[PDB]
Amino acid sequence: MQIFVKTLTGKTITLEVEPSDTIENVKAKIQDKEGIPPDQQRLIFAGKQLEDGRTLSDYNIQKESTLHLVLR
Ligand SMILES: [Zn+2]
Ligand SMILES: [Zn+2]
Ligand SMILES: [Zn+2]
Ligand SMILES: [Zn+2]
């Protein structure tokens, strides 16, 4: 599955993932793309705060879903 992650500045990162990939996996992939440390990353999908050890399928993240990096 392909997803999009938008940074704080609105920059789009395209990621290739699987349903079973954890949010922690996703965060390391962001770090590789942008240099943003996993411990600085807060991810939201469909207004839900995403926990490191849950999976994309656990949040109903699907093909062509968009996640946001946020402050809080
Ligand atoms: Zn795919
Ligand atoms: Zn696999
Ligand atoms: Zn994976
Ligand atoms: Zn894998």
DSSP letters, 11-61, are -EEEEE--TT-BHHHHHHHHHHHH---GGG--EEETTEEPPTTSBTGGGT-
Total number of domains in the chain = 1
Domain containing residue 20:
1-72
Coil, strand or helix at 63:
coil
Q: What is the amino acid identity at position 72?
A: R
Q: Are 69 and 29 in contact (CB under 8 A)?
A: no
**Distance between Cα 20 and ligand 4 center (Å):** 8
For ligand 2, a single-atom ion, which residues have Cβ within 5 Å?
18
Resolution (A): 1.7
Experimental method: X-ray
Nearest Cα neighbor of 16 from 69, 59, 64 is 64
Ligand nearest to the CA of residue 21, numbered in listed order: 3
Distance 33 CA to ligand 2 centre (A): 20
DSSP code for 9? T
Which residues lie closer than 8 Å to 53 by C-beta, 6 or more apart?
Answer: 22, 23, 24
Name the DSSP letter for residue 66.
E
